[PDB]
Amino acid sequence: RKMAFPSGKVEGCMVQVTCGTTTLNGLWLDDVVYCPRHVICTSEDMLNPNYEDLLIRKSNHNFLVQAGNVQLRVIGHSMQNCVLKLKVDTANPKTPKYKFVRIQPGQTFSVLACYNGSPSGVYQCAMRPNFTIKGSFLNGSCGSVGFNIDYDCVSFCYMHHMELPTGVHAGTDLEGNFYGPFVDRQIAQAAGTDTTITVNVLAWLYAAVINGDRWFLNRFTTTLNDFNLVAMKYNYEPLTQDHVDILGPLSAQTGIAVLDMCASLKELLQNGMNGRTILGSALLEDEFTPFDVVRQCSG
Amino acid sequence: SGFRKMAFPSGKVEGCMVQVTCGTTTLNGLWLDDVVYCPRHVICTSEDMLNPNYEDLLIRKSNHNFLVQAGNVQLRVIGHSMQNCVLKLKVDTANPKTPKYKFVRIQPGQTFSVLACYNGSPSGVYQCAMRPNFTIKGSFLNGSCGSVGFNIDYDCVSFCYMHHMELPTGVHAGTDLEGNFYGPFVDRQIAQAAGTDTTITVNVLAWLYAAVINGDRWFLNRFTTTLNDFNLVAMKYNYEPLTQDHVDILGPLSAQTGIAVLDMCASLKELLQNGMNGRTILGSALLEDEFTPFDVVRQCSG
Ligand SMILES: *C(=N)[C@H](C[C@@H]1CCNC1=O)NC(=O)[C@@H]1[C@@H]2[C@H](CN1C(=O)[C@@H](NC(=O)C(F)(F)F)C(C)(C)C)C2(C)C
Ligand SMILES: *C(=N)[C@H](C[C@@H]1CCNC1=O)NC(=O)[C@@H]1[C@@H]2[C@H](CN1C(=O)[C@@H](NC(=O)C(F)(F)F)C(C)(C)C)C2(C)C
Numbered sequence: 001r002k003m004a005f006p007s008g009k010v011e012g013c014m015v016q017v018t019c020g021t022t023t024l025n026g027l028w029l030d031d032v033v034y035c036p037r038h039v040i041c042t043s044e045d046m047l048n049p050n051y052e053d054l055l056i057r058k059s060n061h062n063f064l065v066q067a068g069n070v071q072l073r074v075i076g077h078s079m080q081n082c083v084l085k086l087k088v089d090t091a092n093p094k095t096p097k098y099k100f101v102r103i104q105p106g107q108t109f110s111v112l113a114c115y116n117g118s119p120s121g122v123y124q125c126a127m128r129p130n131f132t133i134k135g136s137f138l139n140g141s142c143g144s145v146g147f148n149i150d151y152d153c154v155s156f157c158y159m160h161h162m163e164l165p166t167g168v169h170a171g172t173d174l175e176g177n178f179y180g181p182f183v184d185r186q187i188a189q190a191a192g193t194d195t196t197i198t199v200n201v202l203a204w205l206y207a208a209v210i211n212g213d214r215w216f217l218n219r220f221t222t223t224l225n226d227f228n229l230v231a232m233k234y235n236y237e238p239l240t241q242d243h244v245d246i247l248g249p250l251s252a253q254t255g256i257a258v259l260d261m262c263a264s265l266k267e268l269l270q271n272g273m274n275g276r277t278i279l280g281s282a283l284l285e286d287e288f289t290p291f292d293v294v295r296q297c298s299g
Numbered sequence: 300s301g302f303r304k305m306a307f308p309s310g311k312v313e314g315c316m317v318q319v320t321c322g323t324t325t326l327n328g329l330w331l332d333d334v335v336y337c338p339r340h341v342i343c344t345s346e347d348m349l350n351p352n353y354e355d356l357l358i359r360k361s362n363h364n365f366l367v368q369a370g371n372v373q374l375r376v377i378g379h380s381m382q383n384c385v386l387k388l389k390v391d392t393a394n395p396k397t398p399k400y401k402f403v404r405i406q407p408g409q410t411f412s413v414l415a416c417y418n419g420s421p422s423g424v425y426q427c428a429m430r431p432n433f434t435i436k437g438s439f440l441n442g443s444c445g446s447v448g449f450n451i452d453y454d455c456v457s458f459c460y461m462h463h464m465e466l467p468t469g470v471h472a473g474t475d476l477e478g479n480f481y482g483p484f485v486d487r488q489i490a491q492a493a494g495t496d497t498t499i500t501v502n503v504l505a506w507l508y509a510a511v512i513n514g515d516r517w518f519l520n521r522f523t524t525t526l527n528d529f530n531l532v533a534m535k536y537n538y539e540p541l542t543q544d545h546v547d548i549l550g551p552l553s554a555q556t557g558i559a560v561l562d563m564c565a566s567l568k569e570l571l572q573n574g575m576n577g578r579t580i581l582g583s584a585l586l587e588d589e590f591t592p593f594d595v596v597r598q599c600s601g
Binding site for chain 2: 005119121125137
């Protein structure tokens with residue numbers, strides 16, 4: 001099934017940041033708190049903000065940072081793209097090993113949804129090819145982060161900023177650069193047409209084969225270039241060299257060449273599933289990555 | 300908005316997980332105060348699991364045969380007792396990370412989070428429900444026993460499940476923290492099958508309300524039905540009956556959407572008799588039944 005990473009290492013980094021009456025969540029690592037810069041905005045400000053001018057008027061003593069009800073004094077502030085960086089007087093004793101990463105469309109991560117600095121729930125999702133995520137976020141969730149854990153290292157990849165009219169969500173990496181062509185202004189914005197994540201569908205078919213569900217395999221293969229041109233006709237993402245590489249381990253485990261699985265997928269796309277299921281499903285799953293299959297099938 | 304299968308944050312439980320070893324058998328334990336809880340079959344060899352004499356096996360053990368590891372540090376066992384299918388190991392150090400907690404026994408249909416662990420180390424968290432046939436549709440591998448399921452209310456962890464075994468159909472079975480199995484199963488390595496399962500009707504309706512709150516409305520219709528006439532059709536399709544307490548607990552979702560519970564029941568009735576026409580609800584091709592009304596209110600309202 002779809003699992004989240006254990007959230008404990010991130011829970012110990014969640015704080016709340018307040019300007020005036022505007023409050024959201026921040027991320028406390030060592031002696032720095034990271035949060036969306038629109039915390040410095042009033043309601044009217046958000047309709048058409050001048051962030052450079054709003055920050056010039058701000059001082060350290062205007063920022064209220066709290067871990068629980070314990071205040072952390074801000075001793076410096078700066079803006080990096082769409083994130084604020086607030087230096088505080090206390091190094092977080094629960095800081096884990098960590099890094100900041102910018103992920104690619106199709107990569108999955110866990111989200112720790114927080115409100116008023118208080119973790120509320122954890123769920124798994126993926127960066128869509130149109131650079132949105134199908135999240136679950138209510139008022140006050142901004143600053144919630146998405147992450148992956150490898151070994152003892154937390155790779156932070158997403159911070160939440162906004163919800164689009166179609167009910168999907170958009171945000172930045174931890175250097176404040178939006179995923180996608182979105183801006184942190186309350187103005188009409190729309191997600192592009194989404195596509196299906198082909199590398200992930202393939203990983204899910206490999207998973208099916210590993211579990212003994214393999215009726216969909218044909219005795220044919222294709223060329224990468226031929227597969228990519230046909231895939232786009234069904235609103236499927238084309239494969240990159242990196243996609244073919246990260247499928248290597250699953251190809252080796254099953255002995256099924258990547259391009260042979262591509263040929264099997266193409267036949268599925270052309271003829272559908274004749275009232276048949278794969279892993280108990282009539283829909284092809286596209287939010288399980290090859291890493292997810294390995295991690296969840298090996299423990 | 301949006302709607303995801305959501306688990307509780309797992310940090311408070313991660314701080315309680317440890318490793319327990321007997322001979323060559325290793326699994327997970329739950330360290331609360333100065334006691335470690337774990338499945339009793341940790342004391343079994345391969346031959347023992349095929350036909351265990353648990354009380355005899357435990358009388359023949361001593362404290363020092365139990366190797367308990369928290370992180371990289373060994374804890375010294377100073378006592379041990381057996382409560383049903385659970386072993387309690389008294390250790391000489393209290394867990395400083397112990398949360399406020401209670402042990403509860405849940406009813407079928409209720410949901411909970413599972414923190415899957417291996418060798419005392421947390422691996423993943425996911426949301427489950429207690430099936431009507433007392434199994435759970437988990438994801439557990441070798442070494443996962445002693446993983447627990449829980450809910451959190453404010454700052455209090457309610458432990459409701461500890462993992463013990465996997466049935467041949469791939470569903471899972473375990474105990475409450477008093478060591479009593481959910482369902483008619485035993486901690487012995489012998490073929491065991493579960494009763495026939497049913498769908499958790501009140502949960503399906505809560506999820507239909509979630510789909511409406513999120514703008515997925517295609518399955519609604521202009522009709523209503525009586526509670527009894529709905530239950531007749533539900534039971535025909537192997538769905539649980541809907542009680543008046545279930546109707547009441549759906550009230551707040553009915554109020555938010557303006558859709559009476561018995562109006563939604565008429566839509567579910569039509570879904571059961573006609574199928575979904577290959578359409579989806581909240582991106583699902585099947586009716587989801589592992590969100591309670593509380594789960595939906597909490598995620599869609601706050
Ligand atoms: C931050 N706590 C929220 C998170 C939102 C609220 C409901 N669900 C979410 O994910 N972010 C905002 O309120 C941001 C903030 C001003 C407006 N905004 C929006 O998300 C708005 N959306 C847009 O303006 C749109 F459509 F362009 F995406 C809103 C209409 C409130 C959903 C700023 C700076 C974008
Ligand atoms: C605990 N570490 C494992 C967890 C298992 C391993 C595979 N997936 C799981 O959830 N539990 C066990 O190994 C228990 C333990 C001996 C046998 N067992 C089983 O789960 C076996 N099942 C059964 O014998 C059956 F059919 F009754 F469910 C197994 C065939 C190994 C899955 C005991 C005492 C039950």
